[PDB]
Amino acid sequence: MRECISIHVGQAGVQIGNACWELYCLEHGIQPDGQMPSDKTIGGGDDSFNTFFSETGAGKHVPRAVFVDLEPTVIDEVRTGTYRQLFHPEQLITGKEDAANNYARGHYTIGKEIIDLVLDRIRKLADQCTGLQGFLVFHSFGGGTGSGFTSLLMERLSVDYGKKSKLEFSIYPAPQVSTAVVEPYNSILTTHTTLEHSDCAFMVDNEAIYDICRRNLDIERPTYTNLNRLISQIVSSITASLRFDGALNVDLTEFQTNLVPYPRIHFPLATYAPVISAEKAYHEQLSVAEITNACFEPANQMVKCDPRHGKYMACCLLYRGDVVPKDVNAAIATIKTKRSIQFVDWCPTGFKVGINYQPPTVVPGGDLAKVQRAVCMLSNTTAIAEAWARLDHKFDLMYAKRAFVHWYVGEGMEEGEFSEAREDMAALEKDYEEVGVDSV
Amino acid sequence: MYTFVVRDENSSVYAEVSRLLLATGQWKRLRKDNPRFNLMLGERNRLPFGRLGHEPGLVQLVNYYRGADKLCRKASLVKLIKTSPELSESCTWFPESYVIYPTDEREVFLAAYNRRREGREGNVWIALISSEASELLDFIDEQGQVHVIQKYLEKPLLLEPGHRKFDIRSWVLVDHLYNIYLYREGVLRTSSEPYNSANFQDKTCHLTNHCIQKNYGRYEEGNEMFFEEFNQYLMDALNTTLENSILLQIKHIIRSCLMCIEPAISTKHLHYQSFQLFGFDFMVDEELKVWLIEVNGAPACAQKLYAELCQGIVDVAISSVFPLATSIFIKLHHHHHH
Amino acid sequence: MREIVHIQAGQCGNQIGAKFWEVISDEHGIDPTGSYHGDSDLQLERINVYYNEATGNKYVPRAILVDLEPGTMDSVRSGPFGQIFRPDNFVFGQSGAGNNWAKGHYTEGAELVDSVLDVVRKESESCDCLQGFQLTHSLGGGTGSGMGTLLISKIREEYPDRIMNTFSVMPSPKVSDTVVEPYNATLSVHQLVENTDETYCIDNEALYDICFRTLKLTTPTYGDLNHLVSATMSGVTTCLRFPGQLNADLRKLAVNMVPFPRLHFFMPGFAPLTSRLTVPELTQQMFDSKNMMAACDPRHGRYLTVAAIFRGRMSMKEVDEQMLNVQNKNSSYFVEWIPNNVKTAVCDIPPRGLKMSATFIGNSTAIQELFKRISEQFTAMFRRKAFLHWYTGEGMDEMEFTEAESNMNDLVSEYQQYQDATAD
Ligand SMILES: Nc1nc2c(ncn2[C@@H]2O[C@H](COP(=O)(O)OP(=O)(O)OP(=O)(O)O)[C@@H](O)[C@H]2O)c(=O)[nH]1
Ligand SMILES: Nc1ncnc2c1ncn2[C@@H]1O[C@H](COP(=O)(O)OP(=O)(O)CP(=O)(O)O)[C@@H](O)[C@H]1O
Ligand SMILES: Nc1nc2c(ncn2[C@@H]2O[C@H](COP(=O)(O)OP(=O)(O)O)[C@@H](O)[C@H]2O)c(=O)[nH]1
Ligand SMILES: [Ca+2]
Ligand SMILES: [Mg+2]
């Protein structure tokens, strides 16, 4: 038991969902029809993969997932695509008309028309769980559904499920692939509304993923397909603790204990290595020390910010593949001998480590080299606040003139909600300042 | 008591600045070779920048930016505009220009020139003015030192009554912090004798220098139209403003030129500080498109405006650094996100 | 699907309307009988945006043809794509406009308006998910201007949360001698600033000047002007018609382009200009005054928002680089207080005749030059009350001309206000 339910909201959440589930099926030996030959218990079980897949009596392994979008196009491609037999039609929920990059439409106008239906379908997955752990919510900050609908849903999930765990994977906007001038508004609005309802949120900077694809995979003009395949690997590394068992595996809840020192300070920085093309991986083993040291290079981060100018409050390492304790221990002892990393004075300078022996998988026809061993570091740095500051500045530039505000007011929102949302963000930036000041 | 030295006696602008500083009672002029100065009003040529900022217990300031000559020499400006990716070779506001040495880009000039002959389009250029290539190249080999062949604006904006050419002088002050200050008063230096499509011999209708204009003075005093009167002309005759039709483009051009060289000339982390007054020369065409002609490193002011500008220079360039015991400048700054 | 309902009103509206339908039918592989004989599935994927699917695998334009003169609508039926239109979508009057706005808006057009609404209703009522409405018209005449804006007002009453989009052709003395047009334009703009979400300003002044100066046409014809109007119309609707990420429907466009509700008048552009290139050239021409369909110099104000659509097989990396390039080199002409206000879309399918093209949609404060020009011509003949009796006769007070003059100058002041505003 310890079931997790994944909720994928809006285009970004949905398209990242596809890549994640595809990748999970490959990692567990599950076919596109849901059959999994290696699983000898037909109809159910309490194996580690059952945190994410339920089972039918016919041997079908079904994702514990809902896909929601206020518009049918993106989910229609899941309904007719390679993995259509994996999902029950009731898990794929669509409306007619989207939120038009407007939080207000996603939260209120359009969103309210489909919210009870979504809770209904979530409830059906919840009632098949013997010991539900919580939820993983995938969504963009920028979109109207991603921002506005996700917020509404998170609020409703707090009411219907108490303090049951809610984790976010949030796509942070970048100008190279953004489709809306108002994305800064939607980001601030959803972050304000969602902050009390989320236990842990992993921000994924599209600009960061865009640069990794250009620099490390030699991809000229990365598309969503390029970005999502890389994002998938990082998500897989994080959920691997839940989906696999192993003597040295540390559960994602244990990492959370270390990562969240105060309720609001729940945004860990993820860093992944190695990201390398097949052509470069040929005749090139990267050792444990090498991939570990790569976790401290900012170019490998999922968010653009500089932890060398901040302070650490936690540092977790999630290894997978051919990795043994001796090498991890030596690699980390070098790091602390060398310094390069400063902790705040109220936090001990530890490194919480997990290892899953099953090596990383890649999707056929992709860009990543299949390597023997990978690592995802989850750190809690004051630096992550840089990302809030960059968005908060863009917000202020527009809001001082009230630019685009009439689109939100026209759907029922008040200016009070904007200034309240922005003050909460100012408070969050101050919190990140305060935790990094030395104690008296 | 702050101290200064005057090392260019010919500068009308800084003669007034020294006068204003002495009048304050808190500045004292020293003799030109006394090195224990706060402010150097420097010479135009061979200014000893290497000697500045090596006097303990004195903050030192000078009225020139070392390396600002790259903007202010005609052959350097062309080269700067051609080689800097920020301005590029496809800069829309600088007339198509080529550097030409006497007995280099003469081969590249002739190619673009002899394309325009076949194209059946206006093919007048300037060093001075002629439409055939022979007279220009022959004038330079004979004339002397390095020269610039630049595209001559066939269709200028012409004032009425009188059908006259003009250029616009804008004064720009760059302070020690690299703030760019456009003085709110500029000036049109007008031709008085009517403009002529065919008559390139007579170079009083074609060249609008306050000296070369010598009829004269008919339409305005000393061939100087100021911005209030010129704004009114634009409103009456063309149904537009100076601000909208011309001044946005001037602002853009100035800010682009000075931002491009900022890394090469800023004194931000230097042992001495610089400020400098520039004079940008602009040409307006009949479509109300602005073009840069030149940047002058040691400009003079127009008689009416001296007192106000020079007191501005003291307030924002000198007294910002050396404080004593309504703003005439527009600060040029723009940070568009992309 | 996301369906749009097209409406074309008056002589100009129906002319440019007809050519719009010729061009996009060509692009989507639709012949005049309404059958698909194209080479690509990308032509059909979003065909339902503009076409109803009838029996026998046929496609009918969701278009409503309107005029107070019955003559102009005979010429449409006689046209190359005339047979494709739905016969009972033709709604025609008797008298004709007489280039009198009041006739179009209050009297003659008012009598006809319910008949148009009946057809609009029947198209709208059988839509899976209606985006909104697209009206082609001129502002200088009487039907397109006066009845067209009445239409707009009446459709808002019944579809108040739908997007109202116009292609509004502006008058120029260089194209038409009719002295009254400044009135018709000012009274129309008065309507459009209140009751549309997005208006493409198609300026005959600009279309004439492009033909005379740049294309070197000595006596430009309405057909020469409309070659530019149709290319503009194909370009600005590309994102609505083909699969894409950016500005893919009318509301998403409006949200990207309209920071203030009244400031919804766009300044389209196109490269290359032709009569009947590299990405850096397309990118430079797009932002240069020569290529604008409104007689405004963008260097005389600032862009609030911009959409740039590149059509053809080109490098997406090169476009990204050039679009950054143009923003850096022209930074002063983009408002600093709306970050990331220029968006870029690349559609692989090029338009007919060209191997690569670029379409520009700008919300510039420079558009005030257009409105000031109209305002000067209006106030020339309104101080002396020339030809007021044409409108007073139909029942209009003189005060409605003052209100409309004042609102159009309010709009001018507002563009200037946001032109002069800083981040500080
Ligand atoms: N990494 C990644 N980002 C995406 C993807 N799709 C969209 N985005 C980003 O998400 C933001 C736009 O939000 P969407 O998720 O498309 O919008 P939505 O949630 O569908 O909301 P509406 O369309 O407004 O109803 C922008 O920042 C895009 O760059 C994707 O597949 N992968
Ligand atoms: N490309 C061009 N088109 C039109 N006019 C031009 C021009 N280049 C120069 N001129 C005219 O010539 C005048 C003076 O030229 P410019 O300002 O380039 O040299 P200058 O002022 O440094 C002369 P000097 O160095 O002897 O003082 C300008 O005011 C302008 O009217
Ligand atoms: N560009 C263009 N302008 C047109 C066309 N037809 C008419 N006009 C202009 O439209 C105005 C007259 O409006 P019109 O459509 O003839 O009036 P209505 O039919 O009574 O609405 C004038 O300013 C004309 O210059 C056309 O086909 N193309
Ligand atoms: Ca089982
Ligand atoms: Mg969407």
Q: Do C297 and B288 touch (CB under 8 A)?
A: yes
* Domain B2-62 sits in CATH 3.50.50.60: no
Which one-letter amino acid corresponds to residue C72?
Answer: T
Per CB-CB distance under 8 Å, the chain C contacts of B245 are 297, 300
Catalytic residue among A254, A290, A420, A429: A254
Q: Taking CB atoms and an 8 Å limit, are C299 and B289 in contact across chains?
A: yes
Domain boundaries, chain C: 2-259, 260-366, 367-424
A234 contacts: CB under 8 Å, gap ≥ 6: A204, A270, A272, A302, A376
Residue A275 Cα to ligand 3 middle (Å): 61
User: Which strands make up the sheet holding B273-274, listed edge to edge?
Assistant: B27-29, B2-6, B39-41, B61-62, B273-274
Is the bond preceding C272 in cis, omega lying within 30 degrees of 0? Answer: yes
A330 in any annotated domain: yes
Is C97 assigned to a binding site?
yes
Q: Determine contact, residues C332/B251, Cβ cutoff 8 Å.
A: yes
CA distances (Å), origin C79, targets C16, C19, C36: 12, 10, 19
Distance from CA of C142 to the nearest CA of B (A): 28
Residue by residue, DSSP assigns B67-91 as TTHHHHSHHHHHHHHHH-TTT-TT-
Nearest residue in C to A404, CA atom: C259
In chain C, residues with a C-beta closer than 8 Å to the C-beta of A220 are: 315-317
d(CA C90, CA C77): 9
Helix axes A183-194, A385-399, angle to 10 degrees: 120
Residues A283 and A214 in one domain: no
Looking at this protein, which amino acid is placed at residue A22?
E
Q: Pick the closest to residue A373 from A224, A305, A272 (CA basis).
A: A272
Which A residues, 208 through 247, put their C-beta within 8 Å of a C-beta on chain B?
none
Q: Does the distance separating the beta carbons of C289 and B248 come in below 8 Å?
A: no
C328:B244 CB<8 A? no
CA pair distance B241, C301, nearest whole angstrom: 11
Window 21-60 of A, Cβ < 8 Å to C: none
For residue B315, what are the contacts with CB-CB under 8 A and spacing of at least 6?
A: none
Question: Do A182 and A301 sit in the same domain of this protein?
Answer: no
Domain match, A216 and A316 both:
no
Could you give the dihedral angle defined by the CA atoms of residues B274, B279, B281 and B282, in that order, rounded to the nearest 10 degrees? 80
Q: Domain B68-71+157-332 belongs to what topology?
A: D-amino Acid Aminotransferase; Chain A, domain 1 (3.30.470)
Question: Terminal CA-to-CA distance of chain A, rounded, Å?
Answer: 45
Specify whether the backbone of A398 is left (phi greater than 0), alpha (psi in -120 to 50) or beta: alpha
Which residues on chain B place their C-beta less than 8 Å from a C-beta of chain A?
337-338
Looking at all shown ligands, the one closest to residue A99's CA atom is: 1
Query: In chain B, what residues touch C288 (CB-CB under 8 Å)?
Result: 92
Pocket around ligand 2 at a 6 A CB cut-off: B 95, 126, 150-153, 167, 207-209, 281, 283, 293-294
Whether the CB-CB separation of C184 and C144 falls below 8 Å is answered with no
Residue A165 and residue A205 in one domain: yes
- Which residues are CB-neighbours of A189 under 8 A, at least 6 positions away? A103, A107, A147, A148, A151, A417, A418, A421
Residue C303 main-chain phi, psi, to 5 deg: -75, 125
User: Is residue C330 a contact partner of residue B333, using CB atoms and an 8 Å limit?
Assistant: no
Using only the alpha carbons of chain C, give its radius of gyration.
21
Gyration radius of chain A's alpha carbons: 21
Indicate if A229 and A295 belong to the same structural domain: no
Domain boundary pick from A385, A414, A435: A385
Contact indicator for A23, A363 with CB cutoff of 8 Å: yes
B337 contacts in A (CB within 8 Å)? 175, 394, 397
Helices (H), chain B: 12-23, 69-72, 74-83, 106-119, 133-143, 227-238, 242, 248-265, 306-313
Q: Does A282 fall in a domain?
A: yes
Q: Does residue A87 sit in the same domain as residue A229? A: yes
Residue A84 lies in a domain: yes
| Structure-block tokens of residue A74 | 């993106």
Give yes or no for residue C176 CB within 6 A of ligand 3: yes
Q: Are residues A225 and A283 in the same domain?
A: no
Distance A370 CA to ligand 4 centre (A): 28
Residue with tokens 């009254």: C180
Compute the Cα dihedral for A175, A180, A184, A188 and give only its sign.
Answer: negative
- Residue B79: which residues within 8 A CB-CB, separation 6 or more? B70, B99
Contact partners for chain B, using 3 or more CB pairs closer than 8 A, are A, C
Query: Which residue's CA is the nearest one to ligand 1's atom 12?
Result: A143
Instruction: Report whether C181 belongs to an annotated binding site.
Output: yes
Chain C residues lying within 8 Å of B236, measured CB to CB: none
Rounded Cα distance, B277 and B306, in Å: 13
Q: What angle do CA C193, C195, C199 make, to 5 degrees?
A: 60
Q: What is the spatial distance between Cα B82 and Cα C356, in angstroms, rounded to a whole number? A: 28
**How far apart are alpha carbons A52 and A45 in whole angstroms?**
12
Of A202, A224, A259, the domain-final residue: A259
A302, A269 in Cβ contact below 8 A?
yes
CATH topology for C2-259 is Rossmann fold (3.40.50)
Q: How many domains does chain A have?
A: 2
Q: How far apart are CA A396 and CA A347, in angstroms?
A: 34
How far, in Å, CA of C36 to CA of B142, rounded? 72
**Among the listed residues A213, A194, A216, the one whose alpha carbon sits nearest the alpha carbon of residue A294:** A216
Residues on chain A touching C339 (C-beta within 8 angstroms): 184, 394, 397-398
Amino acid at C289: S
Rounded Cα–Cα distance for residues A217 and A367 (Å): 6
> Measured between alpha carbons, how far is A205 from A186 in angstroms, rounded to an integer?
15
The residue among A259, A277, A292 that closes a domain is: A259
C330 touching B, CB under 8 A? yes
DSSP structural state of residue B299: P
Sign of CA dihedral A305, A310, A313, A316: positive
Report resolution in angstroms.
2.4
Collect all residues with Cβ–Cβ distance below 8 Å to B125 and sequence separation of at least 6: B113, B131, B136, B149, B150, B151, B152
Q: Which residues pair with C358 in a beta bridge?
A: C271, C310
- The ligand with the least distance to the CA atom of A179 is 1
Structure tokens at A57: 């009596």
C325 is in an annotated binding site: no
What is the dihedral sign for C-alpha C206, C207, C210, C213? Answer: negative
Whether residue A277 sits in one domain with residue A134: no
Give the 3-state secondary structure of chain A.
CCCEEEEEEHHHHHHHHHHHHHHHHHHHCCCCCCCCCCCCCCCCCCCHHHHCEEECCCCCEEECEEEEECCCHHHHHHHHCCCHHHCCHHHEEECCCCCCCCHHHHHHHCHHHCHHHHHHHHHHHHCCCCCCCEEEEEEECCCHHHHHHHHHHHHHHHHHHCCCEEEEEEEECCCCCCCCCCHHHHHHHHHHHHHHHCCEEEEEEHHHHHHHHHHHHCCCCCCHHHHHHHHHHHHHHHHHHHHCCCCCCCCHHHHHHHHCCCCCCCCCEEEEECCCEHHHHCCCCCCHHHHHHHCCCHHHECCCCCHHHCCEEEEEEEEEECCCHHHHHHHHHHHHHHCCCCECCCCCCCCEEEEECCCCCCCCCCCECCCCEEEEEEEEEHHHHHHHHHHHHHHHHHHCCCCCHHHHHCCCCCHHHHHHHHHHHHHHHHHHHHHHCCCC
Tell me, in angstroms, the distance from the centre of ligand 4 to residue A44's CA.
4
C291 is known to lie in a ligand binding site? no
Q: Are residues A229 and A294 both part of a single domain? A: no
Q: Are the beta carbons of B252 and C330 separated by less than 8 Å? A: yes
Distance CA C19, CA A293 (A): 63
Is the CB of C129 less than 8 angstroms away from the CB of A221? no
Report the distance separating Cα B140 and Cα B146, nearest Å: 8
Subunits with 3+ Cβ pairs within 8 Å of A are: B, C
Q: Among candidates A70, A256, A111, A122, which has minimal Cα distance to A193?
A: A111
| Fold assignment, C260-366 | 60s Ribosomal Protein L30; Chain: A; (3.30.1330)
Q: C266 by DSSP, 3-state: which?
A: strand
Beta sheet of C303-312, edge-to-edge order: C90-92, C63-67, C3-9, C130-138, C163-170, C198-203, C265-271, C356-364, C303-312, C342-347
Q: Who contacts C389 (Cβ-Cβ below 8 Å, separation ≥6)?
A: none
Distance from CA of C195 to the nearest CA of A (A): 14
Question: Do the Cβ atoms of C300 and B287 come within 8 Å?
Answer: no
| Residues 255 through 284 of chain C touching chain B, CB cutoff 8 Å | 280, 284
Judged by phi (left if over 0) then psi (alpha if -120 to 50, else beta), residue B223 lies in: left
Q: Could you say which of B240, B248, B336 has the minimum Cβ distance to residue C331?
A: B336
Range of the domain at A361: 269-385
How many Cβ pairs within 8 Å bridge chains B and C? 66
Among candidate residues A73, A112, A66, A116, the one with its CA nearest the CA of residue A92 = A66
Task: Tell me if A391 is assigned to some domain.
Answer: no
Q: Are residues A198 and A301 in the same domain?
A: no
Is residue A298 in a domain? yes
Method used to obtain the model: X-ray
Whether A341 maps to a domain, the answer reads yes
Tell how far CA B290 is from the center of its chain. Answer: 14
C-alpha distances (whole Å) from C26 to each of B42, C34, C360 are 71, 11, 22
Q: Residues B289, B249: contact at Cβ < 8 Å? A: yes
A196 is annotated as an active-site residue: no
Instruction: Choose among C210, C171, C371: nearest CA to C289.
Output: C210
Annotated binding site of A: 10-12, 15, 71, 99, 140, 143-146, 179, 183, 206, 224, 228, 252
Task: Verify whether ligand 3 is closer than 6 Å to residue C135 (CB atom).
Answer: no
Interface touch A397/B337, C-beta < 8 Å: yes
Q: Which residue has the tokens 């670029």?
A: C358
Structure tokens at A91: 């898990």
CATH number of the domain encompassing residue A146: 3.40.50.1440
**Residue in chain A lying closest to C130 (CA):** A97
Question: Contact at 8 Å (CB) between C6 and C116?
Answer: no
Q: What is the homologous superfamily of the domain C367-424 according to CATH?
A: Helix hairpin bin (1.10.287.600)
Q: What single DSSP character describes residue B301?
A: P
